Structures are given as structure tokens and as C-alpha cells.
Amino acid sequence: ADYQVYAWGINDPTEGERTVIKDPWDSVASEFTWISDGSTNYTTSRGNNGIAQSNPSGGPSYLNNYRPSSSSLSFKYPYSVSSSPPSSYIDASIIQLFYTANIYHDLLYTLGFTEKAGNFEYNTNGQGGLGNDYVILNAQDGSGTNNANFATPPDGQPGRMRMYVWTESTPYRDGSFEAGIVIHEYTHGLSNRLTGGPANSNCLNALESGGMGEGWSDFMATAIRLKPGDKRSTDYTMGEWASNRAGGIRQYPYSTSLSTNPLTYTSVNSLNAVHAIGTVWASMLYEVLWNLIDKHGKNDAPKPTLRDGVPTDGKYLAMKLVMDGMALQPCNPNFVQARDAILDADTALTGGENQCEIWTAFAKRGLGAGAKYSSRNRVGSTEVPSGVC
Amino acid sequence: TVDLNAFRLKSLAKYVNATETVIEAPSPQSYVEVATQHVKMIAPDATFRVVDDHYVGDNGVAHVHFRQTANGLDIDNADFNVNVGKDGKVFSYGNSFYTGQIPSSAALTKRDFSDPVTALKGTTNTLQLPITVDSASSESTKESYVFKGVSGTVSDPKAKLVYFVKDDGTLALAWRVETDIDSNWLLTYIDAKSGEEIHGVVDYVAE
Ligand SMILES: *[C@@H]1O[C@H](CO)[C@@H](O[C@@H]2O[C@H](CO)[C@@H](O[C@@H]3O[C@H](CO)[C@@H](O)[C@H](O)[C@@H]3O)[C@H](O)[C@H]2NC(C)=O)[C@H](O)[C@H]1NC(C)=O
Numbered sequence A: 001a002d003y004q005v006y007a008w009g010i011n012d013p014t015e016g017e018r019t020v021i022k023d024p025w026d027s028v029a030s031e032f033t034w035i036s037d038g039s040t041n042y043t044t045s046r047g048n049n050g051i052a053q054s055n056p057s058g059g060p061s062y063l064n065n066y067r068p069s070s071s072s073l074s075f076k077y078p079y080s081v082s083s084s085p086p087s088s089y090i091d092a093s094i095i096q097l098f099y100t101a102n103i104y105h106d107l108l109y110t111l112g113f114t115e116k117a118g119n120f121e122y123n124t125n126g127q128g129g130l131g132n133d134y135v136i137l138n139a140q141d142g143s144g145t146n147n148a149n150f151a152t153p154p155d156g157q158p159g160r161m162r163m164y165v166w167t168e169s170t171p172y173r174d175g176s177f178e179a180g181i182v183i184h185e186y187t188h189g190l191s192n193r194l195t196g197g198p199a200n201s202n203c204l205n206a207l208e209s210g211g212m213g214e215g216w217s218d219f220m221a222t223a224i225r226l227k228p229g230d231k232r233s234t235d236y237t238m239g240e241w242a243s244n245r246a247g248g249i250r251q252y253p254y255s256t257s258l259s260t261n262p263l264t265y266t267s268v269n270s271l272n273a274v275h276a277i278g279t280v281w282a283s284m285l286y287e288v289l290w291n292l293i294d295k296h297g298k299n300d301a302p303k304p305t306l307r308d309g310v311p312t313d314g315k316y317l318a319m320k321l322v323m324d325g326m327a328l329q330p331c332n333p334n335f336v337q338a339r340d341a342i343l344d345a346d347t348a349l350t351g352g353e354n355q356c357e358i359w360t361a362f363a364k365r366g367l368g369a370g371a372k373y374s375s376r377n378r379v380g381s382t383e384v385p386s387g388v389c
Numbered sequence B: 001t002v003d004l005n006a007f008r009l010k011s012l013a014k015y016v017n018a019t020e021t022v023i024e025a026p027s028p029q030s031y032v033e034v035a036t037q038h039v040k041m042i043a044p045d046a047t048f049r050v051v052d053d054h055y056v057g058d059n060g061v062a063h064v065h066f067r068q069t070a071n072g073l074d075i076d077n078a079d080f081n082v083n084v085g086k087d088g089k090v091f092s093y094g095n096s097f098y099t100g101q102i103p104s105s106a107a108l109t110k111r112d113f114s115d116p117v118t119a120l121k122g123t124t125n126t127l128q129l130p131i132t133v134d135s136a137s138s139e140s141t142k143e144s145y146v147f148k149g150v151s152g153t154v155s156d157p158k159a160k161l162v163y164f165v166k167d168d169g170t171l172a173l174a175w176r177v178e179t180d181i182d183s184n185w186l187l188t189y190i191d192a193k194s195g196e197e198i199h200g201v202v203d204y205v206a207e
């Protein structure tokens, strides 16, 4: 099977060219490949991890909606950014969406988001958890523009991703081709499933909790798009291509410069909306990421190398610790608790060899040892505990 | 529909981290048994159920979730999560269990609470949901109902009777009203007694 797509790690059409990729599934994570559910083989964007289709009406139907079919399993369809209307490359859009979501399923699987951990797969292959819950992947969904969204019911019910066309440019830009947005959406499924356990999807719904929900989503998109040549001084924006907006869609770029991005824990005291709060959390996580990369290096391969279950590099280590922290923390956690959960994840995974790197990053942005949660009067701290460094 | 940000749940769980877990402790084994014993030690008066989603992570840490109950109902926002280390001891834990006076089962036995259809109407009207509710309710497999005759939802809305810990710390008897309208997929906690007040709204849809 061939997929003509922007390869994993290319955030948007401005950052690479499309290539033809053969059988891009992970043999462990996708036992039946991406185009089977174990019982049926498909010649389309349908299989164990997701079912992708157009949805021009914006309605709730999906099973019998349009998707391209190829008997030779050659999913190579025309695309150029200068094409109009978006519907003229709906095939390419559906395939790019399907590819990105399936690669992410596979990567998350490798990092521990398996069947028993509440993942999204139709057939659990007896591995635990609840099936019948692949991700519904709607390309060019007609229910909106200039956005995207993701529904995360409890384990056993499908996740539902709706991707929109953006209209802030001529021609319109199809979100299916911004990997970052697809990853942002899918990460809502990850964080909601892991937090409070697979059975409970109520657990990132409080204001500060849902804020972190947004932060984890931006963070994973950002970590994944890291490339050869990136440095601590490299900044990243969110949804800059799709939105046609300088600086992207968040208040500041993700940056290790406090002058470029001044956000700290107490910034949350003045925020009322989850995306703005998310930016603060993702900024803290960006500092963690770079401290871990400085110490352990960065693996530019699309899948980690694991040594006794531990990623060998700082990039995949950061992702792993973030996931493991989601599984440790309480339902509807605050920043301080989620931080402690990340620190405890490192204790459980490595015996605590990264406590200094993690603590220093959080302290840098005011979530140090003395930080205190409050609805309206959070206390910031730049303290790192005695003798961790 | 109204601005749902005003109806978000609270974030007042506690997380007892790995360091504090050792500190607060009293001065092979099954991880579920170890976790259950731990909940009983922390919350000796609580009745609860072990949630059927526990697992051992590829880090070797097991995760067990518990849901508090009262009078045979879930306290829907009262949770306990226990992380059990590979050494078989409790590694860390979180909880939002209710530790106050538990109400009498009288109101339940007497069925002295609102009709689930009244709860659905109160939800629709207060939240200004784009749905039509000249509906009827039908029993399911425990104080759990499905609504028929509703228009504007992706599937039939549902109601389940629960307890709910309000923002003032006290227990409400409430209908949990589920309404999937595609743009939003809501669990609304609406009082089943006093005044039909909405205590919280969960949305499964995130941007
Ligand atoms: C896990 O929870 C523990 C316990 O709450 C946290 O450790 C505690 O951190 C606080 C804040 O730094 C310490 O208090 C402070 O330090 C001294 C008091 O000894 C004083 O200078 C300050 O006024 C303030 O009271 C506290 O001593 C410390 N306890 C221990 C055992 O370390 C810990 O940081 C949390 N996080 C993680 C990931 O472990």
C-alpha cells in the first residue's frame, strides 16, 4: 500500500513536499495494518484505528459518507495549496487526515497508549480495554470553519474529530494538511482517556484542567514537529499556516525566551478561557522538553528507541513522561498536581534521574516548589527543591 | 446554547504525590487488593465501587480507579485513583471522596424527586439547547433512562440518577442528563429536588 502524503513530522505544506510512503504502519501497534479491523480488509481510509471521510453537510453521519477507494491500495491523489474549492482535493485531504491520525495512533501506542490504557481501536485483539472505538475522522467537515474539534466519550465509544477548512486566506486552507491541528485534536482523546482512567471522560473539564487539556494538545503537536537542526532557541507557533496569521493562533510563540513569551503560573489568574490557560501550560512543557533534550539529545527518527522501556532521547522521553503523568494524576487536576505527576512519572520510569531538569523548567515559569493553586489568587514560585540539582 | 464556561466542574481533587505518600503512610500481592485496602484506610466510612478499567502500565505502575457510592447511587464526581508501584506498595494517589454527612435513603425509597423528563426540560431550557423536548422516558438496565421523541440530538438523550458534590461541598441528588448535539456532547448535572438548579456541565467536545 502506498500513501502520497506530507510525511510525519512535516507540520504543514510550507515545511516539506509530499512523498509516496509504502506500508507506513507499525507492525506492533497496528497488528492488522491501518486498513483492516482483523475481520474485514478495506481498500479505503478505513481500518482498526480510524475511519476517514468527507462530511460536507456537517451532520452526524459517517459510515456511508464519501471516501476514496483503490483496489491496488495506491492512495496517491492530487494536491496543491493553490487549488480551489477545497472539495477539488477531498481525496488527498481524507488520505492526509487518515495518515496523520494513524501514525499518531502508532506512536502513542509505542509510548504506552495501548488497548488497556483506553486507546482508540475498533478491535482490541484481546489486549484489554474496550473496542468499537476507532476515531471518526471527518475531513472538510461542513459544521464550521477556522477551527477543529474532538469528542472524547469514555472507553468503548468512538472518538470524533471534525476538521475544518480555514477561510483567512485565498485560496482557503484545508486543516487536514496541518499535522499540528490533527495532532492537537487527537491529543484531546489521549489526555481525556488517560486522565481519571479510560472509564471517566469528565476529568479535563474544570477550567484549569481543561486549560492543561489545551496545553497538552499544543505541546504534543510541537514536540512531534521538532526536526534536525532545531535548537533551544527555536520558537514554534500554533496553526500559523491554516490561520494565515503571523505568530499563529496563541498569545505568544512557544519559546525558551521569557522575553518572547513571558507567561508564568500567575498569568492564569487573569485568564478565563481554556486556550489561553493552555498556552501557559504548553510553555512550561516546552521548557521541560528542551532541558531533557539538552541532557539526553534528540532522536529525529519517527519512533523512539526504548532501553528497558525508557526512551533513549530527550524528545521522546518528554513525551513519555507527559503521557505517564496523565495516567498518575487525579481527575480534574490543577497545574501543581499535574507537575507533581510528571515528576512522579520520572521517578517511576527512570528512578528519578531527571528531577533537576523537570523542576528547573517548571520553576523558570513560576511553577516551582512553592507554587500554590487558587481559583483567582495562585501563588507563583521560582524555587527548585534543595539537592535535586 | 448559553456560554457553558460558567458551568464547568471544579478542580478540587487532592493529589498525594510519591514523596508525600511515603510521609503520610502509617509508621506477591494483588494491586487491586492493595489499592482497595488503601482506599479503606484513607476513607474508612466510604462505600465505593472498583471501576472496571484498572491496568498495569508499561512502566510497571498499576492504576486503579474507584467511584464513591451512597445509598446505591454513584457520587458521580467523587473519585479515588491509586497508583501501585512495581514493588506492590502504593506509589501515589489522588482523591475527591466526599467525607460529609450522607443523606437518608428515604427520598430514594419514596421516589421523592423530579421526573427525568422534567430534568431534560430544565436542562434544555436553562442551557438553551437547540433540541425539541416533547419527550417520554423509558427505563433501562438502575435509575437510568432513555428519552424518546426528542429531536436535534445525534442519539437519544439519557438520564441517570446520581449524587453530586456541589461547589459548597454538600451532596445534591441530581439527574445526570446526557445530550449529544454534535457541536457539544453534554453531561448536565441538574438538581432532582430543590429548584432544578444546574450544578455542572461536562462537554465531551473540545476544540
Ligand atoms: C510532593 O509533595 C511534597 C510535600 O508537600 C513536596 O515537598 C515539600 O515542598 C515544600 C515546598 O518547597 C516544602 O516546604 C517548604 O520548604 C521549607 C519547609 O521545610 C520552607 O523553606 C518553606 O517555607 C516551605 O515550607 C516541604 O518541606 C517539602 N517537603 C518535602 C518532604 O520535600 C514536594 O515538592 C511535592 N512534589 C514532588 C514532585 O515531590
Ligand SMILES: [Ca+2]
Binding pocket: A115, A118, A119, A120, A121, A129, A130, A131, A132, A133, A155, A156
Ligand atoms: Ca478503546
Ligand SMILES: [Ca+2]
Binding pocket: A191, A192, A193, A194, A195, A196, A197, A198, A199, A200, A201, A202, A203
Ligand atoms: Ca479518562
Ligand SMILES: [Zn+2]
Binding pocket: A184, A188, A213, A214, A217, B206, B207
Ligand atoms: Zn484543543
